[PDB]
C-alpha cells in the first residue's frame, strides 16, 4: 500500500504470461534496428608532365583522325594504398560466450538479457558476426535463444526484429542448407511459437476497421 501512500503507481512488467507485451523502451528502436544499414550508408560523410601527351585534331594531325587511329584500375590501386595507409595510421566476446553457455545449459535467459541491453550498433555487429561454417552451431543456438524469448511473451517487438537481421545477414546460409536437420528442427520449433503469435494481427487490424467505420459512418 506504500504506492497508494505516495499517490503513485508503477505499471507491471507484464500483466499476464499469455499476454503479449512490448519492450520497456523507445518504440523507435525497432525502426532503427530494421533499417540500420541505410542509416550507415546515409550517415557517411560527404567526400603537368614535361612530355605532355596529346594527339589528333587538336594538335593539327587531322590525318590521324581521318585515318581512324585514335585509369579506373589506377584508382582501384590508389584505394588499396589509402587503406594500406590507414592500417599504418593506427597501431593499437561476451556475447558469443553466453551463447555457448546457453546451449550448454539450455537456458538463454542470461543471453537474452544482454541482447536487450546492447545498443543497436552493438546488435547488428553481433548478429552479423555469427559464424557460417558447418555445423552452424551458433545460428542454431541463436534461433533457440529467440525461440525461448517468444515463448516468454515479453519484449515481443525486439525478438521479432532480431531474426529479421539474422535472415538478412544469414538468410542465404540458412537457405543453402535448408535440408540440414539441426537448422530445420530449430527452425521448425520457431514456427510453432510464432504461429501462435498471429492473434495480435487480428486485434490490431480489427480495431482499425471498426474505428475507421465508426468515425466515418
Amino acid at each position: 500500500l506504500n504506492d497508494i501512500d505516495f499517490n503513485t503507481y508503477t505499471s507491471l512488467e507484464q500483466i499476464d504470461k499469455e499476454l503479449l507485451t512490448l519492450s520497456i523502451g523507445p518504440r523507435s528502436k525497432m525502426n532503427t534496428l530494421l533499417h540500420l544499414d541505410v542509416i550507415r550508408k546515409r550517415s557517411k560523410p560527404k567526400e603537368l608532365p614535361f612530355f605532355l601527351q596529346l594527339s589528333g585534331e587538336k594538335v593539327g594531325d587531322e590525318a590521324s583522325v581521318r585515318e581512324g587511329i585514335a585509369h579506373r584500375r589506377d584508382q582501384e590501386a590508389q584505394k588499396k594504398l589509402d587503406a594500406e595507409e590507414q592500417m599504418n595510421k593506427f597501431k593499437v566476446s561476451h556475447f558469443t560466450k553466453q551463447l555457448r553457455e546457453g546451449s550448454q545449459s539450455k537456458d538463454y535467459s542470461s543471453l537474452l538479457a544482454t541482447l536487450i541491453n546492447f545498443s543497436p550498433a552493438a546488435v547488428d555487429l553481433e548478429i552479423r558476426s555469427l559464424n557460417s561454417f558447418e555445423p552452424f552451431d551458433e545460428i542454431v543456438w541463436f534461433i533457440d535463444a529467440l525461440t525461448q524469448g517468444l515463448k516468454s511473451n515479453k519484449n515481443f517487438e525486439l525478438y521479432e526484429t532480431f531474426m529479421s537481421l539474422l535472415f538478412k545477414a544469414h538468410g542465404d546460409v540458412i537457405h543453402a542448407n535448408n535440408k540440414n536437420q539441426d537448422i530445420a528442427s530449430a527452425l521448425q520449433n520457431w514456427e510453432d511459437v510464432h504461429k501462435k503469435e498471429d492473434r495480435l494481427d487480428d486485434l490490431v487490424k480489427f480495431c482499425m476497421g471498426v474505428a475507421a467505420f465508426v468515425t466515418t459512418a
Binding site: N31, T32, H35, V38, I39, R42, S43, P45, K46, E47, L48, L52, L54, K58, V59
Partner: protein, 83 residues
C-alpha cells in the same frame, strides 16, 4: 565574338597546357553575383522590414541538415511507374 589583337601572355606550351587541363571563370562570376544580391537583398529588406531581420550567412564535411530521413532508402522514394 571578339578576337584579341595583342600578343598573348601565354606561350604555345601554355595554351596547349591549358587544353591538357561550364567554365570555372563563369562559375566564379556565378557566385560573385549571388553574394552581391545576398548582401543587397539584406540591406534593402532591413530598411523595409517592420520586424527583425538577421544578417544572411580539404576535409570531409558533415551535412548538418538533410532533405530526407536517414532510415528512408533511396529505392523507396521511387514510384513503381518510375522504376
Amino acid at each position: 565574338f571578339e578576337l584579341s589583337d595583342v600578343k598573348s601572355s601565354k606561350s604555345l606550351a601554355e595554351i596547349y597546357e591549358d587544353d591538357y587541363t561550364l567554365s570555372e571563370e563563369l562559375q566564379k562570376a556565378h557566385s560573385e553575383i549571388s553574394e552581391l544580391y545576398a548582401n543587397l537583398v539584406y540591406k534593402l529588406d532591413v530598411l523595409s522590414s517592420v520586424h527583425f531581420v538577421p544578417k544572411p550567412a580539404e576535409t570531409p564535411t558533415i551535412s548538418m541538415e538533410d532533405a530526407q530521413p536517414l532510415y528512408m532508402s533511396n529505392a523507396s522514394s521511387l514510384a513503381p511507374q518510375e522504376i
